[PDB]
Amino acid sequence: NLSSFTDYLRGHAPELLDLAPHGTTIVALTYKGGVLLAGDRRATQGNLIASRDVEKVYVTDEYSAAGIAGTAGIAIELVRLFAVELEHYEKIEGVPLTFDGKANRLASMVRGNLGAAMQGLAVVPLLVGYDLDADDESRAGRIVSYDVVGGRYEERAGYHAVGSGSLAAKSALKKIYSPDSDEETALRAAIESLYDAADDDSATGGPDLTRGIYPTAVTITQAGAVHVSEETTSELARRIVA
Amino acid sequence: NLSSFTDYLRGHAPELLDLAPHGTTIVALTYKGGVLLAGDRRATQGNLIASRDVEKVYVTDEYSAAGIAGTAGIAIELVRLFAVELEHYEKIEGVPLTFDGKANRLASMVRGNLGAAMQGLAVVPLLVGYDLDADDESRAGRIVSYDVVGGRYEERAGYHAVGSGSLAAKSALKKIYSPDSDEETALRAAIESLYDAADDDSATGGPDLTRGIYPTAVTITQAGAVHVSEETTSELARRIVA
Amino acid sequence: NLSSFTDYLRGHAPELLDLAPHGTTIVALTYKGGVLLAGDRRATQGNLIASRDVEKVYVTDEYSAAGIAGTAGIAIELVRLFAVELEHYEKIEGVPLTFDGKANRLASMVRGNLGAAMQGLAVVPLLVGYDLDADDESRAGRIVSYDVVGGRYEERAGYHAVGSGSLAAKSALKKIYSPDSDEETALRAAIESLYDAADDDSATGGPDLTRGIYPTAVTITQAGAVHVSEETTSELARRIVA
Amino acid sequence: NLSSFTDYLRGHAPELLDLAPHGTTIVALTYKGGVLLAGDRRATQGNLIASRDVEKVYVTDEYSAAGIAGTAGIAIELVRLFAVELEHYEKIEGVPLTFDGKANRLASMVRGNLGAAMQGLAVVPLLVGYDLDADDESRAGRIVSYDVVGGRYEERAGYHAVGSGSLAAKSALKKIYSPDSDEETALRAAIESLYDAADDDSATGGPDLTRGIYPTAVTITQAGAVHVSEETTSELARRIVA
Amino acid sequence: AEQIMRDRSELARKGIARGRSVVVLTFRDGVLFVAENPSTALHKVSELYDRLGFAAVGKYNEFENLRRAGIVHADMRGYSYDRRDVTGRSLANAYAQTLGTIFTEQPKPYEVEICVAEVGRVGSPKAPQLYRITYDGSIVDEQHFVVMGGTTEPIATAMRESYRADLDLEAAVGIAVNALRQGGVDVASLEVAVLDQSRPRRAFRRIAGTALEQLVPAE
Amino acid sequence: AEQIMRDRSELARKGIARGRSVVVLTFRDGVLFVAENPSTALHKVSELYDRLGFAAVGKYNEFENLRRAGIVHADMRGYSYDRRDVTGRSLANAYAQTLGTIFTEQPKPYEVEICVAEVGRVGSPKAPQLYRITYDGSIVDEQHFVVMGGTTEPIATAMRESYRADLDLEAAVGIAVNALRQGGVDVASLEVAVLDQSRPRRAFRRIAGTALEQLVPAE
Amino acid sequence: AEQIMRDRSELARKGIARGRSVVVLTFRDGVLFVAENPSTALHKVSELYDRLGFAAVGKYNEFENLRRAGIVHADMRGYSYDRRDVTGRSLANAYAQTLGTIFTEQPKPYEVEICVAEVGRVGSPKAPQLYRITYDGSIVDEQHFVVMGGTTEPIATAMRESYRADLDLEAAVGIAVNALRQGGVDVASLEVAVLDQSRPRRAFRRIAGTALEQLVPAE
Amino acid sequence: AEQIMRDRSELARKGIARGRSVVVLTFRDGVLFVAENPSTALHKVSELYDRLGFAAVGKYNEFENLRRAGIVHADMRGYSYDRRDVTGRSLANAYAQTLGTIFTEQPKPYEVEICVAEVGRVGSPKAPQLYRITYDGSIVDEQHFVVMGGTTEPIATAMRESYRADLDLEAAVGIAVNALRQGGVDVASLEVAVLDQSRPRRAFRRIAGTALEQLVPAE
């Protein structure tokens, strides 16, 4: 009634707002064309590996997507709802939300989970997108990070990451990354830091050539977001290796 | 009023949403025809055996079934309700729910027990079914696993398991299981890992030839789901033995 | 308004849903005719005896009855209500409830005490009955046991028991009991295990010839349920002794 | 609106449902005529005596009365209400409640205090009355004891008691009391056990010839309940002494 | 405008009138229920409690409610206190207050006439009691027999001059089934039950078919 | 439209009028309740409290309510404060207010006329007091006698010229039972009771049958 | 004013009348549902439960509600107690009370007519039962066949003289389909289903197109 | 007084009639929406869901609501279960029920006529389905074409004789845009859109201006 799918639940169906299968690392990079996300696929509850093919990055809408790190269960439902929060606002208003809108909404949804956060079951996302309303379509890609209490933060440094191996990846990128670059160079630097994060972090564990486990990726541009193929990643991580 | 039997209680009869008789292991295998469930029958409250004939796997609907591990009291009522939720949605909508619907529902019912979970009385299901809406009716059998916080997860490895001897069984299958196979072969590998789960876990205790205690099973295919006979099981477990 | 007396209170009078005088042992046996209940009569709060003539088994309806173990206070009101729930469902529906119904009801009422249960004041019943809808009126006798979280369970072994000395009585029957037998033989094995229960348990203390304290019994058959006579018991326990 | 004065409060005035001045022992005897109640009069908050003339036994109505043991405060208001409950139900229904009614009602009122009970402030009554509806007007007297969780129990042994020196008194009666006897013999045995209770319990302290402190009594019979005179007791307790 | 009560009243009286009839009587065993009921499934007479029977007339749904409402108001008191305290007079007043209120406030009064019957405990020398409550909340303590439904006048008098105490059961069946015929045809196509003061608990049983034959007199 | 009160008013008056009558009086023992009640189970006079009696007229269910409601409103006060503080004035007013509101708001006014009577404690020289409340919230402090129901005029004056203080009970029964006959026939088929100031507590007993004989005068 | 019931009633009767019709019958396999339904997507007959069928007529949304409402009320009991206890009588009465209330209180009565059908468990020798509930809350226990909607008179008698027990399926379809034509045209453009007592659980299936052909008789 | 439904009914009919019209059809790509809409900003047809379209007529605000409401009810189901379960039939009934209620209860009925269209998933051989719901809660399963608004008679028949399956898009636009002219003028000043069964998700695109030219036939 404010075009918020969520707010409709708020008033008509409130029941929708390591004991259980954890998180992983996710990276975000900015570039010439637009932006992208790449995240590990290993879910770990305890020191035990629970799944090695879990997708952590989802395409929220035509021109944006996000990866969430934290309690898998709480993080899944949260992104799905975000997606719908977005799509519904369009169908209703006819146009889509600003990118700064989509972010402020996602922030609200996070703020909502703070309760569960302070009880261990926390979750934090990373939001990226091609700002169709940015003046210079050169730097139209964006990265938003979050708090647990629901803060919204701007990247303004071309890259970021969240997860257990984030401190690692962030550092690798602090080296292997440079501004305006190919959507091939950045998809490269991502698989890289996603490799170093796995080196110094048993919770992550990036590209595993022996098993066939490859990082998931997604690139958004002036054309929209699309999920990179399993081929463009494996023959891409093989290149990274030495 | 959204065709959710559950949601009706939610608003018209909310009173329906080791101190007490525990769980056991349950296995799930995929194959050529469809999929199946086989699970132990030993209920144990403490180190004490409480019942050796408890059915842990139920047929939820025409083309699907699930096994639930955890507090028996809570796990029974929960599946019986899931059953109804599915059947009611049909009679109202005329058609049945997608498989992906049945699971999303089941997950919500689990998320519903999270309160009781964080108090010891936790329960976790394993869902299988013949996706009548799957493109390649070859790999139309599916396996969904759950969180305690209610996460929904896809198998994508042809087998899975839940329960105390799950780690065991999962490992046995990692060796004794191969893709596309008979509905005799898989039912074979099932009774197998279910035997190995009993080897390394006092809480389970699979096939017992001396007592006449045989694993419960269920296969689902393009014809639907049917509970395997007590004969097809015993003369099957005898074969497995050596 | 669903013919549930309980549910009526639920919405029109909710105020009806070792600090205090404990439990005792109760046995259940299946046989040719029907089934029966036999239970101790010693109520013990602490190590102190509170009463030696308390009846633990009641006739719920024409073709069924049950015994409850746990806090006497709670257990009494609970069975009295169960009786009513049944009788009231009859007068309204004109017909009586399935046996499987009476059971599902009793279990709901138990689940309803789960709160008090986790605070020490727990109670658990044993339900028996002649299933007027059973195909083979030979094995028409049934035994249902319960959890604390309100699980319903089928005997499927001709006998059961609940209470402090249950473990003991169960074991006695595991020996002194055999399938299809007289309504004189089973009532015999009942006073027997009820004796062994008292041997290895100071909370029980079955048949006491010196005091005149004899086990309470009740048998149900195609003719209905009837409470055995004080005579049929004493001259029966005297027979058991040696 | 079901003729329950209480239940009226329930919906129209809910605010009516050793830090503070304790209890004492109370005895109950059955006999040829009817029944009777006798109870100490010493109220003790700690080891300190707070009052030595407190009446513990009250006449509920025409053919019944009860003594309450526990927190003086809570026990008083409770019996006064019980009385009212009974009287009102008469003025409304025209007739008076069965004895079994009065008791089940008292139980409910006890079950209601269970909250305060688990918080120290517990009370427990002893109910007696001439059952106008008993077949054999010979044993028409009855004794009902209670739980804290509100259980109702039948005497069925001619006597009973509640309070600190109840274990004592109960034991004295186990000897000094015999069935069908005078309303003089019983009132004698009563003042007796009430003397013995005082021996082995500083919290009681029955008949004190020196101070003029005499046990309070009440007898009920086919004529009704009448409070025994201060003379019939003292010249009765002097007789007991040696 | 005010004597709508006049109207409302007529509404009920008429609806009751234009429908089958029932007769309840006092006899030897206890109390007998004879009412024209072609239905094979939906009864018009029911066990209200241990020593309590109930029968009514008017629109089904409407008295059906009031039947259940009773079944409940009875159980309640029985559980709250003691089965031994559930009376006929309690449910009587009850019904009275209810109907009297419907009449006054419901958009349409209840086209119903109800009869509550209690056959004394399982021993004492007390004679049964009968209660009739009207669509507007009116009660009367009938000790002999009671008739309601359709055209009462004929069947009414056909009883006034036809009633006898200690009346045998087989004969009591006649006494009533006859007077019923004297106003409206009489096949063993009705429903009959009885409140048997012999019984220790239930006290209410229904005379099935095979055994009703030998009780109802022919033309 | 506005003088609906005129209407409603007439609705009650007429309903009350078209019904049996009652007489309440002041005498030696305390207070006498004589009212025409053919009913063997349902009374029309009740112990309202320790020193209080109640008797009414109109539709049953309707005063029956108000009766129960008093019993409670009384009990309440006696529990809340002290039985010694339950008065007749309290219940009078209470009823005044209740009916008054009923009259003004309920869909149909209460076809009821009520009498609350209090016979002084168990000693003092206080003379009973009588209260009458009408279907519209009107009270009057009657110290002698009170009449209600049916056609009051005949029975009314039949007392104005027939009343005597300290009147003997046997004689007070006559005085009333007579006047009752003077307007409507008078068999020992009524209900009589009395608020006996001799009694220490209850103060309310009903004169049964075997003993009423010797009190009511014949034709 | 008061006999608004008359009005409201007509409102229903008429609306039902001016619309397609339905026929439900008892036979060999269990129970047959034949109703004029041009609609390719919106049904008029539905599986109400394990052994329960439902079919109505009148404004769709209105009976569609009552259909769902049933489905729920069934499931509830099944869950609350045991599928084995869900009966047709239960759902009958239910509907009865519901419509009865709507008729009395809703701003506009429901132009609906409903039929509930239960075909015995999977074995016992019990013959199917049929129930019919009218827009005003009236039920009848039909053991044979039932017809509702449009103009019943013709199709009604067209069956009173055309019904046979143990009636084959193919033939039962005729019996019905025929009587339907005798009032209003009869292409394999309707919806037909059956409660097949042979089935162990579901018991309710619909007869699709390719297979209906070989059942319905031409002109 | 009762056939207020007659009145209310007219009120909507008239309001719908005195306004621009809409035509929805079944063709090759899937489903086409052509409705007179001079407005540059406010629509009349909207994506309801993945494979669901919606178009109404009547007072804007009123169907605007019903539109959002749908958008919500869909989203809800999709989130609750799976987008794959959101259907047309579902939003159909839903609207039926809502309007049906509005008609009966709201102070003023809704001057609206609605059309819900669902074009099969992204593969299977299922032919689109159309749903029309009237201001009073009436639905019909149209498989060919649907017309609502203004004067349907001319435009209706102009189609009855002008409709063809597998109709090319360019041609289906003509068929419709023509009939439309045959009742009322026809500039590329309207709003058109289509549910394209080719699409894998969205399935609903609107045919803008520059490309609508080459579709609509001149005078």
Side-chain angles (χ1 to χ4, degrees), chain C residues 117-134 140-151 153-154 156-169 171-176 178-179 181-183 185-191 193 195-207 209-210 212 214-216:
Chain C
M118 288 176 91
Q119 271 194 283
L121 306 182
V123 289
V124 186
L126 227 197
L127 185 75
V128 294
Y130 187 71
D131 186 16
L132 274 45
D133 290 83
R142 293 175 66 181
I143 292 174
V144 185
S145 61
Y146 294 76
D147 256 14
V148 202
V149 315
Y153 303 94
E154 264 282 43
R156 291 179 187 181
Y159 67 98
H160 203 64
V162 297
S164 0
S166 64
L167 297 168
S171 295
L173 284 345
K174 193 179 189 178
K175 301 300 171 197
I176 69 175
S178 58
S181 61
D182 297 49
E183 183 198 297
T185 288
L187 179 40
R188 162 89 276 82
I191 303 294
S193 54
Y195 226 91
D196 302 311
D199 267 7
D200 323 314
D201 176 6
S202 74
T204 303
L209 313 169
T210 295
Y214 305 81
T216 286

Side-chain angles (χ1 to χ4, degrees), chain B residues 46 49-51 53-54 57-61 63-76 78-132:
Chain B
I49 297 187
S51 193
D53 78 306
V54 172
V57 292
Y58 295 75
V59 187
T60 53
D61 84 349
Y63 293 74
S64 70
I68 30 58
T71 313
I74 304 300
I76 291 318
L78 174 77
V79 85
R80 172 210 193 55
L81 182 90
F82 182 58
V84 173
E85 235 280 344
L86 298 184
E87 206 176 73
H88 181 281
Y89 179 95
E90 194 172 58
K91 305 201 278 296
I92 301 282
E93 286 302 316
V95 316
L97 273 174
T98 304
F99 175 66
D100 283 54
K102 307 166 175 177
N104 211 299
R105 267 282 91 187
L106 210 227
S108 196
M109 280 185 258
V110 164
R111 180 162 162 284
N113 180 79
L114 184 275
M118 284 181 89
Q119 273 191 290
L121 311 177
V123 291
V124 194
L126 223 203
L127 185 75
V128 294
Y130 190 74
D131 197 3
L132 279 45

Side-chain angles (χ1 to χ4, degrees), chain H residues 70-83 85-112 114-116:
Chain H
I71 303 290
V72 165
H73 185 81
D75 263 343
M76 264 303 318
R77 280 169 172 280
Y79 183 70
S80 190
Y81 296 97
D82 189 22
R83 326 188 59 91
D85 294 287
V86 181
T87 78
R89 171 129 69 94
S90 297
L91 290 121
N93 290 294
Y95 275 124
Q97 198 203 30
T98 304
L99 280 171
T101 306
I102 297 168
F103 192 72
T104 315
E105 291 170 54
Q106 211 68 176
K108 175 196 96 74
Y110 259 28
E111 287 162 298
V112 175
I114 290 180
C115 171
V116 173

Side-chain angles (χ1 to χ4, degrees), chain C residues 83-134:
Chain C
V84 178
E85 242 273 0
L86 297 183
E87 207 178 69
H88 181 276
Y89 179 91
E90 196 169 62
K91 302 202 280 294
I92 299 283
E93 288 302 308
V95 317
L97 272 178
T98 305
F99 174 70
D100 282 53
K102 308 166 169 190
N104 210 308
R105 269 289 93 183
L106 217 219
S108 198
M109 287 184 249
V110 158
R111 177 159 164 288
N113 179 65
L114 186 281
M118 288 176 91
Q119 271 194 283
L121 306 182
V123 289
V124 186
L126 227 197
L127 185 75
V128 294
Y130 187 71
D131 186 16
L132 274 45
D133 290 83

Side-chain angles (χ1 to χ4, degrees), chain F residues 3-5 7-9 11-12 15-17 19 21-27 29-35 37-43 45-47 49-58 60-83 85-112 114-117 119-120 123-125 127-131 133-152 154-159 162 165 167-168 171-177 179 183-186 188-190 192-200 203-204 206-207:
Chain F
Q3 305 310 55
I4 302 309
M5 310 320 271
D7 300 69
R8 308 190 107 259
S9 180
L11 197 169
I16 294 170
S21 299
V22 187
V23 192
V24 181
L25 49 66
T26 293
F27 75 104
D29 296 335
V31 171
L32 183 55
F33 292 97
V34 192
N37 191 38
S39 177
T40 89
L42 326 190
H43 311 319
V45 179
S46 162
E47 157 174 49
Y49 206 54
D50 283 349
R51 315 308 280 186
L52 300 150
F54 161 110
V57 276
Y60 185 52
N61 49 304
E62 272 171 41
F63 54 65
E64 172 64 336
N65 265 53
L66 302 153
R67 201 251 306 182
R68 298 202 186 204
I71 301 287
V72 160
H73 177 72
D75 271 336
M76 268 301 308
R77 278 168 178 277
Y79 180 77
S80 192
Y81 306 99
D82 187 8
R83 326 187 53 106
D85 298 278
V86 179
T87 73
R89 178 125 68 85
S90 304
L91 294 127
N93 290 293
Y95 277 124
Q97 197 198 44
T98 302
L99 289 167
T101 314
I102 291 183
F103 194 68
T104 320
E105 291 158 52
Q106 211 72 179
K108 163 197 104 62
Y110 260 39
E111 289 165 296
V112 168
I114 293 174
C115 187
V116 172
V119 180
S124 85
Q129 180 71 62
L130 245 49
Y131 286 100
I133 320 80
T134 72
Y135 62 103
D136 89 334
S138 314
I139 43 298
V140 283
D141 41 304
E142 204 64 7
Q143 292 199 306
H144 297 310
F145 319 68
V146 191
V147 167
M148 47 196 236
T151 65
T152 45
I155 318 173
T157 58
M159 287 263 316
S162 180
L167 222 163
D168 175 11
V173 173
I175 287 304
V177 68
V185 175
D186 234 46
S189 193
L190 351 160
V192 174
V194 47
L195 233 64
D196 199 0
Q197 201 182 317
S198 89
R199 239 79 158 304
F204 173 117
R206 343 166 65 62
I207 317 287

Side-chain angles (χ1 to χ4, degrees), chain H residues 129-131 133-152 154-159 162 165 167-168 171-177 179 183-186 188-190:
Chain H
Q129 183 75 66
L130 261 44
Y131 285 102
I133 319 91
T134 74
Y135 59 108
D136 83 326
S138 310
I139 43 296
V140 279
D141 42 298
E142 201 63 10
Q143 295 198 302
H144 296 310
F145 315 65
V146 189
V147 176
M148 50 205 228
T151 69
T152 53
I155 323 177
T157 61
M159 290 266 310
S162 174
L167 223 166
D168 167 17
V173 176
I175 291 306
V177 64
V185 174
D186 231 46
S189 196
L190 353 155

